[PDB]
Scaffold this motif. Structure first.
Motif, PDB file in Angstrom:
ATOM      1  N   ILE A   1       0.225   6.986  -6.245  1.00  0.00           N
ATOM      2  CA  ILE A   1      -0.416   5.720  -5.905  1.00  0.00           C
ATOM      3  C   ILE A   1      -0.764   4.934  -7.163  1.00  0.00           C
ATOM      4  O   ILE A   1      -0.845   3.700  -7.130  1.00  0.00           O
ATOM      5  CB  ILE A   1      -1.654   5.966  -5.021  1.00  0.00           C
ATOM      6  CG1 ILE A   1      -2.133   4.656  -4.388  1.00  0.00           C
ATOM      7  CG2 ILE A   1      -2.774   6.615  -5.820  1.00  0.00           C
ATOM      8  CD1 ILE A   1      -3.344   4.818  -3.495  1.00  0.00           C
TER       9      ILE A   1
ATOM     10  N   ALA B   1      -7.862   0.803   0.597  1.00  0.00           N
ATOM     11  CA  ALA B   1      -7.095  -0.355   1.060  1.00  0.00           C
ATOM     12  C   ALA B   1      -6.990  -0.385   2.583  1.00  0.00           C
ATOM     13  O   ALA B   1      -5.940  -0.705   3.145  1.00  0.00           O
ATOM     14  CB  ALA B   1      -5.708  -0.399   0.415  1.00  0.00           C
ATOM     15  N   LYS B   2      -8.089  -0.046   3.260  1.00  0.00           N
ATOM     16  CA  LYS B   2      -8.111  -0.130   4.716  1.00  0.00           C
ATOM     17  C   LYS B   2      -8.235  -1.570   5.196  1.00  0.00           C
ATOM     18  O   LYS B   2      -7.802  -1.886   6.310  1.00  0.00           O
ATOM     19  CB  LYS B   2      -9.254   0.717   5.280  1.00  0.00           C
ATOM     20  CG  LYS B   2     -10.636   0.115   5.095  1.00  0.00           C
ATOM     21  CD  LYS B   2     -11.659   0.810   5.976  1.00  0.00           C
ATOM     22  CE  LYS B   2     -11.827   2.264   5.577  1.00  0.00           C
ATOM     23  NZ  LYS B   2     -12.311   2.398   4.176  1.00  0.00           N
ATOM     24  N   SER B   3      -8.820  -2.450   4.381  1.00  0.00           N
ATOM     25  CA  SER B   3      -8.898  -3.861   4.737  1.00  0.00           C
ATOM     26  C   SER B   3      -7.584  -4.583   4.470  1.00  0.00           C
ATOM     27  O   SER B   3      -7.263  -5.551   5.167  1.00  0.00           O
ATOM     28  CB  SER B   3     -10.034  -4.537   3.968  1.00  0.00           C
ATOM     29  OG  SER B   3     -11.207  -3.742   3.989  1.00  0.00           O
ATOM     30  N   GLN B   4      -6.820  -4.132   3.472  1.00  0.00           N
ATOM     31  CA  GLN B   4      -5.516  -4.730   3.212  1.00  0.00           C
ATOM     32  C   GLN B   4      -4.545  -4.444   4.350  1.00  0.00           C
ATOM     33  O   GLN B   4      -3.717  -5.296   4.695  1.00  0.00           O
ATOM     34  CB  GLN B   4      -4.956  -4.217   1.886  1.00  0.00           C
ATOM     35  CG  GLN B   4      -5.870  -4.444   0.695  1.00  0.00           C
ATOM     36  CD  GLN B   4      -5.269  -3.942  -0.603  1.00  0.00           C
ATOM     37  OE1 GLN B   4      -4.064  -3.701  -0.691  1.00  0.00           O
ATOM     38  NE2 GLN B   4      -6.107  -3.781  -1.620  1.00  0.00           N
TER      39      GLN B   4
ATOM     40  N   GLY C   1     -12.193   1.790  -0.929  1.00  0.00           N
ATOM     41  CA  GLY C   1     -11.200   1.943  -1.970  1.00  0.00           C
ATOM     42  C   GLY C   1      -9.863   2.489  -1.521  1.00  0.00           C
ATOM     43  O   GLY C   1      -9.006   2.752  -2.371  1.00  0.00           O
TER      44      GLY C   1
ATOM     45  N   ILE D   1       0.839  -1.192   0.000  1.00  0.00           N
ATOM     46  CA  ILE D   1       0.000   0.000   0.000  1.00  0.00           C
ATOM     47  C   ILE D   1       0.877   1.246   0.000  1.00  0.00           C
ATOM     48  O   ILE D   1       1.924   1.299   0.659  1.00  0.00           O
ATOM     49  CB  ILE D   1      -0.961  -0.021   1.202  1.00  0.00           C
ATOM     50  CG1 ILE D   1      -1.887   1.197   1.177  1.00  0.00           C
ATOM     51  CG2 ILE D   1      -0.193  -0.088   2.512  1.00  0.00           C
ATOM     52  CD1 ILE D   1      -2.858   1.249   2.337  1.00  0.00           C
ATOM     53  N   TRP D   2       0.458   2.254  -0.759  1.00  0.00           N
ATOM     54  CA  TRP D   2       1.194   3.502  -0.885  1.00  0.00           C
ATOM     55  C   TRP D   2       0.684   4.517   0.129  1.00  0.00           C
ATOM     56  O   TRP D   2      -0.508   4.549   0.448  1.00  0.00           O
ATOM     57  CB  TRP D   2       1.067   4.073  -2.301  1.00  0.00           C
ATOM     58  CG  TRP D   2       1.634   5.455  -2.449  1.00  0.00           C
ATOM     59  CD1 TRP D   2       2.905   5.783  -2.820  1.00  0.00           C
ATOM     60  CD2 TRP D   2       0.949   6.695  -2.228  1.00  0.00           C
ATOM     61  NE1 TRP D   2       3.054   7.149  -2.844  1.00  0.00           N
ATOM     62  CE2 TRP D   2       1.868   7.731  -2.483  1.00  0.00           C
ATOM     63  CE3 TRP D   2      -0.352   7.028  -1.836  1.00  0.00           C
ATOM     64  CZ2 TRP D   2       1.529   9.077  -2.362  1.00  0.00           C
ATOM     65  CZ3 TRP D   2      -0.687   8.365  -1.716  1.00  0.00           C
ATOM     66  CH2 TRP D   2       0.249   9.372  -1.979  1.00  0.00           C
TER      67      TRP D   2
HETATM   68  N1  LIG Z   1      -2.110   3.375  -1.092  1.00  0.00           N
HETATM   69  C1  LIG Z   1      -2.509   2.345  -1.867  1.00  0.00           C
HETATM   70  N2  LIG Z   1      -1.630   1.557  -2.508  1.00  0.00           N
HETATM   71  C2  LIG Z   1      -2.034   0.536  -3.276  1.00  0.00           C
HETATM   72  N3  LIG Z   1      -3.318   0.219  -3.474  1.00  0.00           N
HETATM   73  C3  LIG Z   1      -4.301   0.930  -2.890  1.00  0.00           C
HETATM   74  C4  LIG Z   1      -3.939   2.058  -2.035  1.00  0.00           C
HETATM   75  N4  LIG Z   1      -5.076   2.595  -1.581  1.00  0.00           N
HETATM   76  C5  LIG Z   1      -6.089   1.868  -2.103  1.00  0.00           C
HETATM   77  N5  LIG Z   1      -5.627   0.868  -2.870  1.00  0.00           N
HETATM   78  C6  LIG Z   1      -6.476  -0.098  -3.610  1.00  0.00           C
HETATM   79  O1  LIG Z   1      -7.785  -0.146  -3.044  1.00  0.00           O
HETATM   80  C7  LIG Z   1      -8.389  -1.357  -3.482  1.00  0.00           C
HETATM   81  C8  LIG Z   1      -9.378  -1.870  -2.452  1.00  0.00           C
HETATM   82  O2  LIG Z   1      -8.725  -1.995  -1.198  1.00  0.00           O
HETATM   83  P1  LIG Z   1      -9.577  -2.440   0.084  1.00  0.00           P
HETATM   84  O3  LIG Z   1      -8.616  -2.986   1.101  1.00  0.00           O
HETATM   85  O4  LIG Z   1     -10.721  -3.290  -0.383  1.00  0.00           O
HETATM   86  O5  LIG Z   1     -10.184  -1.083   0.675  1.00  0.00           O
HETATM   87  P2  LIG Z   1     -11.641  -1.142   1.336  1.00  0.00           P
HETATM   88  O6  LIG Z   1     -11.819  -2.499   1.958  1.00  0.00           O
HETATM   89  O7  LIG Z   1     -11.848   0.100   2.160  1.00  0.00           O
HETATM   90  O8  LIG Z   1     -12.605  -1.047   0.055  1.00  0.00           O
HETATM   91  C9  LIG Z   1      -7.251  -2.332  -3.695  1.00  0.00           C
HETATM   92  O9  LIG Z   1      -7.339  -2.925  -4.987  1.00  0.00           O
HETATM   93  C10 LIG Z   1      -5.981  -1.525  -3.583  1.00  0.00           C
HETATM   94  O10 LIG Z   1      -5.114  -1.780  -4.682  1.00  0.00           O
END
Ligand SMILES: Nc1ncnc2c1ncn2[C@@H]1O[C@H](COP(=O)(O)OP(=O)(O)O)[C@@H](O)[C@H]1O
Ligand SMILES: Nc1ncnc2c1ncn2[C@@H]1O[C@H](COP(=O)(O)OP(=O)(O)O)[C@@H](O)[C@H]1O
Ligand SMILES: [Mg+2]
Lengths: 642, 583
Positions: free
Chosen positions: A469, A322-325, A320, A279-280
Motif C-alpha cells: 500500500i 480510506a473508507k471515506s474515499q 486512515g 485505493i489498494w
Molecule cells: N488501500 C489504500 N490505498 C491508498 N490509500 C489509502 C489506502 N488505505 C488508506 N489510504 C489513505 O488513507 C488516507 C485517509 O483516507 P480516508 O478516506 O480519510 O479514511 P478515513 O476517512 O477512514 O480516515 C488517504 O490519504 C489515503 O491515501
C-alpha cells in the motif's frame, strides 16, 4: 388580444378529445395536448406560450360551449380547467430564470417539500354592512392579504371578511428541485416553489419525479422595492415523469459493446478492479460494493408483500483506511447516487422530516437523501454520527423501504427504495478485535441486522500488506497509468450498471438452489452445542438466508446472466464467509454480534449473575468470572439500573 | 333567496315528524327526513345544499309557526332545530374538499378525539361603560371571543364583557376521521374538525363510527395567523353507522360461495394452509391464528356479565422466525384488522391517552388501535416494547374489553371489544427453554393469562427443518406459485370470516360439553396437588376452560356449523394441549 376570436378558434379545434369527456361526467378536467392543437391551429397554440393568462381563460369558456352544444350536456356547468400536459420544449429548474415569467413553461424536476391541503378563498367577498357586499377582490392563494381601504359605494370604512358567501378552493404548495439522478451534475439543488389547485392537490409526494407544466407567476411579498422578490410557478397540469427520462439511457451502439463485455472472460474480476482503482487492497470490500451496485431482483408476491431487492453495505474501520474515499469513487460510478454525510446538516438531511416553512409558517414535508435517491444509491459517510430522529426511521426505511411520517399535520408514506452503502467509525477511536462490533459501534444493535454486508476495514501492521500500500500510494501520487485507470472505463461502467439493473433479471436455478440450501444447513449446529444448558448460539439466521439469495442473484446480474448459475451462488458464499470472519464468525465463535451479541457467553453469564458488600464477594468464590470481569459486568448493569 | 317564500314552502310541507313533536315535549331538535322534503319540493330541498344558513333558519322559523298556529301549541315559541338525518349523497372524509364549504354535507367516518362540555356564548352582548350596551354580536363557538373597536352610540371605548345577559350554550368539539377498517385500502387518515351543539353534545365517544350530516364552515379568520387556511364543520345531526355500510359486502351469490366452501372437504386444514402460505411450518401456530379469527359468540348472561369472544393470541418468538410476516398476511386477510407497532409517535398509539388539544388547549380524549378496531382484530408487533401507560391500559382492554379513563376531566369509558394478535420478543436474546417465560418477558404474568393461546416460536438449527425451510424460502423468491397461492383466495377468505362471525353462532352441545368437562378434570385435578405444597402449578383451570370454550366454538364457526360437535371440542384439545407441550 382577440379573446372572442380565440374562443371560436378553440371551439374549431375542439372533437374526439372532448368526446370521451362528454361521456365521463365526474371528470372535472380535460387533458389537452399542445402538439394536437399545434397541428389544428399553430397560431392559436403559439398564443398559449406567449399570453397564457388570456389563453387558458378563453379556452375554458370555449370548450364549455363545445360541451353544452352537443348532446349529453351536463346540467351544472362544472369548471373545466384546460390542462396542457404536453409542450414543445422541456425546461430545467437550473435553466429556469426570470425570462420565462408569465410564459407557459414545462419544467422537470423532483418534489422535495410539500404543504398540507390548505383551503383558500377564490372570490373574496368582503362584508360591508353599509354597502358593497358582493364585491370581489380576486386573490391568489400565495398572494398576501387583500383588503380595500374604503368602500366606493357609500364611503364607509367598516371593512370585514364575508366567509359565508366566499367560495373556497383547495390549495397546496410544493417545492420542485433538480433531480439528483442526472441534474446533479450542476451540483446546485436549485428550487422553484410552485402551487397546486383543484385536481392538482395531493397529486404527488415528496421525492417523486414529476413533469409539471404551468404558468410562471410572481408575488410581491416584500414592500422594500417595487420589483418582485420571489417567483412562484402556478402549475396548470402535473404529471409524473416517464421511465425513459428518469432513468439512464444507453445508445444502441453501446448496447452491443455492453453485451460484448458480458461475454468477456473474468468480467467479475474486471469490475472489481475497476471500482476505486486508487485505493489498494480491500478486494473483498470492492466485490461486496460491486454486488450492492448490481442489486438483486426486486419481486412482488400476489399476496400483497414485496420482496426486497437491495443489499446495504456498512464499512466499519479505524481512521486512515480510506473508507471515506471508497464512498467517493462509487458516488460517481453509480448511476443514481447521492453522496452525503451522516451529520444532520438539515432537518431532513438523512430521513424525511417535517419543518415549518419560512413563508407562511406551515409545516412542509422535506425529503431526505433516502427519499430523493429512491430506486438508486445513497452513500452515507460517517454513519455512526446521526440524529435521534434519523436513527428511529432508518430501521423501517432499510427493510420495508417506506418512511411513514404522521406528525406536524402531514401524514403520508414515502418510498425509500435506496441501497444504503454506508460507512461508520467506532466510538472508541479504533476498533478492538477483543470486543464485538456493536460494543464499539454507535449504531443500535437492531440496526446492524439490516445490512447484508458488513466489512471490517481495520488497520493491521504487517510488512507485506504495508509495503504494497505504500508503493501503491506512491504510484498514485507519481501519476502512474495503470495505478489510477480502471480496466473498464467509468463512463462505460456507469452504463453497464444501469443496463443490468433494468434489463437483466436473473432467476434462481435448481443448481444454485441446492448450493444455497447446502450452505444454510452447513452453518447450523456449528456452535449451538457449545453453549449448552442455556441460550444456544444460532450461527446463521433466516434473515441472512434472504441476504445470501440477494447476493447470489447479484453475482448473476453482474455477469448479465438471466439465471443464477451454480458458480454465481458459490461466489456469494465466499463473500458471506469472508464477512463471517468480520462478524458472527472468527470472533467469539459463530453467532457473534448477531442481533446484539453472540450470547454464547455474555448472555450465558448474564443469567448467572442475575449495602451490596456481600454480592461482590459472592461473585468472587462463585468462579463465574475474574475480579476484573465481574467488575466491568456491574458497570454495564449500573448503566441500565441493575 | 325568496326567504319569505321558503317559509311558506316549509310551512306547507309541515306532518308525521311534527306529530312526534307533540308526543315528546322536551324536543329541542326535531328530526326531518330528506326524502320527505325532496318528494315535496326538489327545488326547495336543493336550496338546503346551496345556502344552508338561510335554509335551516327559515326551516325552523316556518315550523315555529306550525308550533304555535295549529292547536295543541306550546305556550311560547319553543326553540326547535331543523335536524336532518339524510342526504342524497354520503361523502367521505378523504373525498371531502374545500369546495363543500358553506354547504350541507353528509360525511361518514370514525371519531378519535372528543372534548368536554364547554359553555360558550352564542350572543355576547358587550356592555359599554358610557352608553350603547344594547349592541350585540353573534359569537360563534368555533371562533374565539371577538372585540369591537369602538361603540357606535356614543363613540366611547370603555367596553367590557357582560356575562349576566349573555346566553351561554353548551359546546363540544370532536375530530372525525376516516374508517380504519372499511377504508384501510384508501390509506388516508385525514380528518375534519367538527363541533357539537347543545343537542349533540356528548353524543359519541372516540372510536365510534357515526354518520354526521352538517355544514362545512370555515375559520379562515384567525387572530394568530390571518391566512389560517382552516375549515371546520358544524354538524346538524349525528347518527352511528349502520351495519349495511360500515362492514364488508356479502352478496347472495357470494354468501352461496361461502356456504359452498363449507361443503368443500378438509377446510379445517385448508384454512391453516391458506393463512400466510409464504412462511413454512407453524401448523399449530397458523391454526391458532385461524382459531382467533373465528372468535367465539358474545352472549349477555342475565347475571350482567358477558362471555368474551375475543380469543387473544400471543406469538413469543426469536428474531428471524418471520413472526412479523404472520402479522402482515393476517392483517390484510382479516376483515377488521389494522397494523401497528409497540412504539408509536402519536398521542395514543394504544387504547387511550389524555393531552390538551392544539386549538384551545382543552383536554381531549384520544383514541388508538384497540378502539378504532372495535368489533374486529388488532395485530401489534413489538408488543413487548410499550410504555408504562400502555402496559396498564391494555390489561383492561384485553381481558375486560373496557377502557376506563377519567383523568383530565374527560369522563369516559371506552369499550375495547378487540381480538388482539400480539407477538412479543424476549429481552434475553434467543428464547432459552431452561428458564420460564415471565423471567424473559417484561409482560405481567396476569397479562399472559389474557392471551388464550401463546405460541413459543423459535429457529432451531435442525438441518431437517432448515433444508425444508431453505427450499421453501427459495421457492417464494423464485416465483413458484405453490408457495404463494393459498388454498382459499384472500378476497374469498376475507368474506368467509365476516359471514362466519355475523351469521354462524355456535351453541354448546352435550357432546362438546362432556369432552370439555372430561379434559378439564383429567389435567386440572391431575396436577392440582402440584409439588412440594406451597404454590402448586396450575395447568388447565377455570379461566383456561373459559378460553377452552372459545376454542371449541371457534372450530364450529370455522366450518360454518351451528352445533359444536365433540370433534370440534377434540380439535380444541389438540391446540390447547400443544400449549402445555410448547410451554
Ligand atoms: N488501500 C489504500 N490505498 C491508498 N490509500 C489509502 C489506502 N488505505 C488508506 N489510504 C489513505 O488513507 C488516507 C485517509 O483516507 P480516508 O478516506 O480519510 O479514511 P478515513 O476517512 O477512514 O480516515 C488517504 O490519504 C489515503 O491515501
Ligand atoms: N417458516 C418460514 N418460511 C419462510 N421464511 C421464514 C420462516 N421462518 C422465518 N423466516 C424468515 O424470517 C424473516 C423475517 O423474520 P422477522 O419477522 O423479521 O423476524 P423479527 O420480527 O424477529 O425481526 C424472513 O426473511 C424469512 O425468510
Ligand atoms: Mg420484527
Amino acid at each position: 388580444m382577440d379573446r372572442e376570436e380565440m374562443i371560436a378558434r378553440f371551439a374549431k379545434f375542439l372533437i374526439n378529445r372532448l368526446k370521451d369527456l362528454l361521456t365521463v361526467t365526474p371528470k372535472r378536467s380535460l387533458a389537452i395536448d399542445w402538439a394536437h392543437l399545434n397541428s389544428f391551429d399553430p397560431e392559436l397554440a403559439d398564443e398559449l406560450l406567449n399570453n397564457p393568462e388570456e389563453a387558458i381563460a378563453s379556452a375554458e369558456d370555449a370548450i364549455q360551449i363545445v360541451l353544452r352544444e352537443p348532446p349529453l350536456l351536463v346540467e351544472r356547468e362544472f369548471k373545466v380547467h384546460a390542462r396542457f400536459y404536453n409542450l414543445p420544449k422541456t425546461l430545467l429548474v437550473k435553466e429556469l430564470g426570470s425570462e420565462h415569467i408569465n410564459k407557459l413553461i414545462q419544467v422537470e424536476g423532483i418534489i422535495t417539500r410539500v404543504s398540507e391541503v390548505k383551503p383558500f378563498v377564490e372570490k373574496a367577498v368582503f362584508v360591508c354592512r353599509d354597502c358593497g357586499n358582493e364585491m370581489v377582490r380576486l386573490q391568489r392563494p400565495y398572494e398576501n392579504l387583500v383588503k380595500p381601504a374604503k368602500c366606493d359605494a357609500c364611503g364607509s370604512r367598516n371593512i370585514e371578511l364575508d366567509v359565508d358567501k366566499s367560495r373556497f378552493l383547495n390549495f397546496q404548495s410544493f417545492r420542485l428541485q433538480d433531480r439528483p439522478e442526472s441534474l446533479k451534475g450542476g451540483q446546485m439543488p436549485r428550487f422553484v416553489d410552485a402551487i397546486l389547485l383543484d385536481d392538482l392537490v395531493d397529486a404527488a409526494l415528496p421525492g417523486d419525479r414529476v413533469l409539471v407544466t404551468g404558468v410562471l407567476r410572481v408575488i410581491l411579498e416584500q414592500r422594500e422595492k417595487r420589483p418582485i422578490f420571489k417567483k412562484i410557478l402556478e402549475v396548470n397540469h402535473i404529471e409524473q415523469l416517464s421511465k425513459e427520462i428518469e432513468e439512464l439511457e444507453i445508445s444502441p451502439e453501446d448496447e452491443q459493446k455492453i453485451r460484448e463485455l458480458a461475454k468477456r472472460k473474468d468480467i467479475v474480476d474486471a469490475i472489481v478492479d475497476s471500482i476505486a482503482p486508487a485505493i489498494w487492497g480491500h478486494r473483498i470490500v470492492k466485490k461486496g460494493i460491486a454486488l450492492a451496485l448490481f442489486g438483486g431482483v426486486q419481486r412482488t408476491l400476489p399476496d400483497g408483500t414485496k420482496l426486497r431487492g437491495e443489499s446495504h453495505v456498512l464499512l466499519v474501520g479505524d481512521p486512515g483506511v480510506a473508507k471515506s474515499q471508497l464512498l467517493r469513487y462509487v458516488a460517481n460510478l453509480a448511476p443514481r447516487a447521492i453522496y452525503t454525510s451522516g451529520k444532520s446538516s438539515s432537518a431532513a438531511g438523512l430521513t424525511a422530516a417535517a419543518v415549518r416553512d419560512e413563508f407562511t409558517g406551515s409545516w412542509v414535508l422535506e425529503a431526505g437523501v433516502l427519499v430523493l435517491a429512491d430506486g438508486g444509491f445513497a452513500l452515507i459517510d460517517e454513519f455512526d454520527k446521526m440524529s435521534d430522529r434519523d436513527r428511529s426511521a432508518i430501521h423501517e426505511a432499510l427493510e420495508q423501504q417506506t418512511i411513514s411520517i404522521s406528525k406536524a399535520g402531514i401524514t403520508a408514506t414515502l418510498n425509500s427504495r435506496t441501497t444504503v452503502i454506508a460507512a461508520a467509525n467506532p466510538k472508541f477511536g479504533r476498533f478492538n478485535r477483543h470486543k464485538s462490533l456493536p460494543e464499539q459501534l454507535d449504531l443500535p444493535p437492531t440496526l446492524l441486522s439490516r445490512f447484508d454486508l458488513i466489512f471490517l476495514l481495520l488497520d493491521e501492521p504487517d510488512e507485506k500488506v504495508d509495503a504494497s500500500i505504500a508503493e501503491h500510494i506512491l504510484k498514485v501520487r507519481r501519476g502512474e497509468a495503470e495505478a489510477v485507470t480502471p480496466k473498464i472505463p467509468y463512463d462505460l461502467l456507469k452504463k453497464y450498471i444501469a443496463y443490468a439493473r433494468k434489463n437483466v433479471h436473473p432467476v434462481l436455478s435448481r443448481e444454485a438452489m441446492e448450493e444455497i440450501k447446502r450452505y444454510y444447513v452447513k452453518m447450523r449446529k456449528g456452535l449451538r452445542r457449545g453453549d449448552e444448558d442455556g441460550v444456544q448460539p444460532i450461527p446463521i439466521t433466516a434473515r441472512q438466508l434472504e441476504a445470501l439469495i440477494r447476493l447470489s442473484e447479484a453475482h448473476a446480474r453482474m455477469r448479465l446472466s438471466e439465471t443464477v448459475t451454480r458458480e454465481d451462488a458459490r461466489a456469494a458464499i465466499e463473500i458471506i464467509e469472508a464477512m463471517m470472519k468480520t462478524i458472527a464468525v472468527d470472533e467469539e465463535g459463530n453467532l457473534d454480534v448477531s442481533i446484539l451479541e453472540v450470547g454464547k457467553s455474555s448472555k450465558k453469564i448474564n443469567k448467572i449473575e442475575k449495602p451490596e458488600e456481600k454480592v461482590i464477594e459472592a461473585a468472587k468464590q462463585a468462579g463465574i468470572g475474574t475480579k476484573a470481569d465481574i467488575e466491568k459486568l456491574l458497570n454495564e448493569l449500573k448503566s441500565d439500573g441493575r
